């Protein structure tokens, strides 16, 4: 009635990918920055997909 | 596959991975066709990330 | 389909191997009779050849009728073959390897994907026997399967220059070959050999068994030696001529030693490194079949 | 050099070295001493060096041969100097 | 330069284990603010002698 | 018997079989490709073999 299996699957997908971006070690400061900003963008794609 | 040159240095490179995942979901068949040519990209991503 | 006799296909006059020499189509044995040798202080001890890899390379999905005989012969004795491992078409032999395959090997040496009218072909059981090994020419390039390209040449020399005593012994002095020679003798020899229908000799080598096979090894030893001679000139560190009272003795040095030379020369056909890998593999498979 | 100057200066430089690594509870692992030292030595700007930085656990190994193999496959390179 | 050498060689940053002892990076690396939310702290402000 | 090579002997032969490429095979024509530059000049791996 409310849950849509597709958007939910994409939720777990973005969950995995954000966990992976977060588990990505880097040297550069800017790479550290984008490592954070990508998690936000991931979360945003998640809502858009929903 | 129209080829993608991605070294997967930046965390933002994860975009390309997601680009395939979406392609895998929205178009599973055409994906099955180009999947090895995707695997050539994803292997760079794996060797560089894991 | 050409039936295989109680002897090999080589028993047919249609498949006879000969090099042109002194104005006639001489049999290889009467060329090798001209050959003489000079032993040096260096020695050659033959080690056991490693068994060929079990794994048969997949033939790819190839619509065309691949010309496998021209590919192999030019790869070994060809005056200007290069990058022989790049196209990778030798793997196509594996298509023949299966029981009841729809493919046939033409006397032309082309591997048709299906039987076709007015094209004679070797008996598929025998060809399966031949493909079952020689498809392994397909992995000459792949790193996990490469043949040795140094030690194997010892065996080459042994089967060429080696006397029956040195051959039973398994050791010989590193002989330097020589023969009374016409202009360009080695190139013209190599081109006489390139036109050889070697698939016949290999099919008989891989399919014949017992007494028929042993009689084959005795009947064709000089043909084998001739191919070995062309290959050995390909690897010879140098090939000089010697003036000798209104005569010229061609001399290649040395038999049984692969110099791994790649830079070309007018005297003989030259191996690009790929040709070295291919030749080494071919020798591995062929000597393996030749000693059993 | 008097012992006391040498000993303590050596103690200082030995304290200075901090190899990158991942501790592990498995009883079969050994650190790839050579690769980790070479990695540190270049301030981790060599491709093998940054390979050690992003994944230090790669230095750990059981079977001695695969220790360098995993680096070759991971870097896609035919060898290392 | 020598002081900074030993310093930056100790590590630009550090974390705090469950034991509570500081463990340094051993690795020179510019601080970025994303790190502020993580387990890392800048090393100058550590006050470990 | 194999045929005698035409250069092996001094006789002149005025019919010969010249192989030649057809309109399909072409050589020396210019060739298009898609160059793609490294994303960042500083990320480029000058060093390791």
* Domain boundaries defined on chain C: 1-292
Chain D residue whose CA is closest to A24: D54
**Is C20 within 8 Å of F2 when comparing Cβ atoms?**
yes
Contacts of C195 in chain F (CB under 8 A): 2
- In contact, C210 and C137? CB cutoff 8 Å: no
Q: What's the rounded Cα separation, in Å, for the pair C17 and C233?
A: 19
- In contact, C291 and C159? CB cutoff 8 Å: no
Helix (H, G, I), strand (E, B) or coil at F47: coil
What DSSP letter does each residue of C199-220 carry, written as one string? Answer: HHHHHHHHH--HHHHHHHHHHT
Helix (H, G, I), strand (E, B) or coil at E13: strand
Q: What's the rounded Cα separation, in Å, for the pair B27 and C139?
A: 37
A25 touches chain D (CB under 8 A): yes
Chains that touch B (3 or more CB pairs under 8 A): A, D, F
Q: Which residues pair with residue C44 across a beta bridge?
A: C172
CA distances C279 to C137, C147, C223, C265, Å, are: 9, 9, 17, 18
Residues 6+ apart with CB under 8 A from E17: E23
**Is F49 within 8 Å of D77 when comparing Cβ atoms?**
yes
Exposed / middle / buried, residue F18 (Cβ in 10 Å: 0-12, 13-18, 19+): exposed
Resolution in A: 3.1
What DSSP letter does each residue of chain C carry, written as one string? Answer: -BPP-SS-GGGSGGG---EEETTEEE-HHHHHTT-EEE--S-EEEPPPPPPPPSPPPPP----S-EEHHHHHHHHHH-SS---TTTS-GGGGHHHHHSTT-S-EEBTTSEEESS--TT--BB-HHHHHHHHHHHGGGGGSSSGGGPPPSSTHHHHHHHHHT--HHHHHHTEEE--EEEEE--TTHHHHHHHHHHTS-HHHHHHHHHH--HHHHHHHHHHTHHHHHHHHHHHHHHH-SEEEEEE-SS-EEEEEE-TT------S-BTTB----HHHHHHHHHHHHHHHHHH--
**Is D55 within 8 Å of B50 when comparing Cβ atoms?**
yes
F40 touches chain B (CB under 8 A): yes
DSSP H or E stretch at residue E15: strand E13-16
Side-chain-side CA neighbours of C63 within 13 Å: the count stands at: 0
Chains that touch F (3 or more CB pairs under 8 A): B, C, D
- In contact, C137 and C278? CB cutoff 8 Å: yes
| Closest listed residue to residue C151, CA positions, set C226, C257, C75 | C257
DSSP H or E stretch at residue E42: strand E41-42
First CA to last CA distance, chain A: 15
Q: What's the rounded Cα separation, in Å, for the pair C287 and C221?
A: 12
| Closest listed residue to residue C17, CA positions, set D77, C8, C215 | C8
| Closest listed residue to residue C4, CA positions, set C137, C201, C198 | C201
Q: Which residues pair with residue C179 across a beta bridge?
A: C250
Chain D residue whose CA is closest to E6: D16
E38 touches chain A (CB under 8 A): no
Method: cryo-EM
| Closest listed residue to residue C239, CA positions, set C202, C187, C274 | C187
Residues 6+ apart with CB under 8 A from F46: none
Q: What's the rounded Cα separation, in Å, for the pair C64 and C66?
A: 6
Q: What's the rounded Cα separation, in Å, for the pair C191 and C232?
A: 15
| Closest listed residue to residue C255, CA positions, set C176, C189, C173 | C176
Chain B residue whose CA is closest to F36: B5
Residues 6+ apart with CB under 8 A from D10: none
The pairing of beta strand E22-24 with beta strand E13-16 = antiparallel
Count Cβ–Cβ pairs < 8 Å, chain A vs chain B: 30
CA quadruple C119, C123, C124, C127: dihedral, nearest 10: -100
A17 touches chain B (CB under 8 A): yes
Chain D residue whose CA is closest to E28: D43
Distance between B9 CA and the closest CA of chain F, angstroms: 8
């Amino acid at each position: 009635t409310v849950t849509n299996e597709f958007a939910s699957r994409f939720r777990t997908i973005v969950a995995t990918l954000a966990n992976v971006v977060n588990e990505r070690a880097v040297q550069d400061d800017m790479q550290k920055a984008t490592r954070s900003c990508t998690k936000q963008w991931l979360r945003h794609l998640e809502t858009q997909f929903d | 596959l129209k080829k993608i040159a991605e070294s997967f240095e930046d965390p933002s490179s994860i975009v390309v991975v997601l680009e395939f995942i979406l392609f895998a979901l929205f178009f599973p068949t055409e994906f099955n066709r180009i999947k090895g040519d995707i695997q050539n990209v994803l292997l760079l991503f794996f060797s560089r990330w894991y | 389909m050409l039936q295989q006799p109680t002897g090999g296909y080589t028993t047919l006059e249609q498949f006879a191997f000969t090099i042109r020499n002194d104005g006639t189509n001489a049999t290889p044995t009467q060329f090798l009779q001209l050959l003489s040798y000079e032993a040096t202080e260096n020695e050659l001890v033959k080690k056991t050849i490693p068994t060929p890899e079990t794994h048969l390379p997949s033939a790819r999905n190839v619509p065309g009728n691949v010309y496998i005989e021209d590919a192999i012969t030019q790869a070994l004795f060809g005056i200007s073959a290069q990058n022989v491992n790049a196209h990778g078409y030798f793997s196509r032999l594996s298509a023949l390897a299966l029981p009841n395959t729809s493919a046939r090997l033409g006397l032309d040496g082309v591997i048709y994907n299906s039987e076709t009218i007015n094209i004679p072909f070797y008996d598929p059981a025998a060809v399966a026997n031949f493909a079952a090994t020689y498809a392994k020419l397909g992995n000459a390039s792949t790193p996990r399967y490469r043949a040795d390209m140094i030690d194997i040449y010892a065996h080459v020399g042994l089967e060429l220059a080696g006397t029956d005593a040195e051959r039973a012994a398994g050791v010989m002095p590193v002989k330097r070959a020589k023969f009374d020679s016409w202009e360009g003798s080695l190139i013209s020899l190599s081109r006489d050999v390139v036109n050889w229908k070697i698939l016949a000799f290999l099919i008989d080598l891989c399919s014949l068994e017992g007494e028929a096979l042993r009689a084959f090894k005795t009947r064709n030893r000089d043909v084998f030696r001739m191919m070995l001679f062309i290959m050995s000139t390909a690897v010879a560190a140098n090939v000089v001529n010697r003036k000798v009272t209104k005569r010229v003795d061609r001399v290649l040095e040395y038999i049984g030693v692969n110099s791994m030379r790649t830079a070309g020369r007018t005297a003989t056909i030259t191996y690009d490194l790929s040709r070295h890998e291919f030749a080494a593999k071919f020798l591995q498979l062929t000597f393996t079949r030749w000693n059993a | 050099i008097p012992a006391d100057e040498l000993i303590d200066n050596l103690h200082s430089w030995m304290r200075s070295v901090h190899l990158l690594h991942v501790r592990s509870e498995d009883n079969t692992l050994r650190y790839n001493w050579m690769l980790g030292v070479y990695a540190r030595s270049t301030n981790y700007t060599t491709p093998v060096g940054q390979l050690v930085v992003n994944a230090p656990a790669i230095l750990n190994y059981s079977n001695p041969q695969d220790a360098f193999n995993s680096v070759f496959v991971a870097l896609g390179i035919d060898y290392i100097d | 330069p020598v002081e900074y050498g030993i310093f930056v060689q100790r590590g630009a940053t550090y974390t705090i284990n469950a034991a509570g002892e500081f463990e340094f990076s051993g690795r020179n690396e510019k601080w970025d603010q994303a790190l502020y939310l993580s387990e890392h702290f800048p090393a100058l402000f550590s006050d470990v002698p | 018997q194999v045929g005698i090579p035409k250069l092996e002997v001094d006789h002149i032969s005025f019919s010969n079989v010249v192989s030649m490429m057809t309109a399909n095979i072409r050589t020396g024509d210019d060739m298009a490709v898609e160059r793609v530059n490294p994303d960042d000049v500083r990320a480029i791996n000058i060093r390791n073999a």
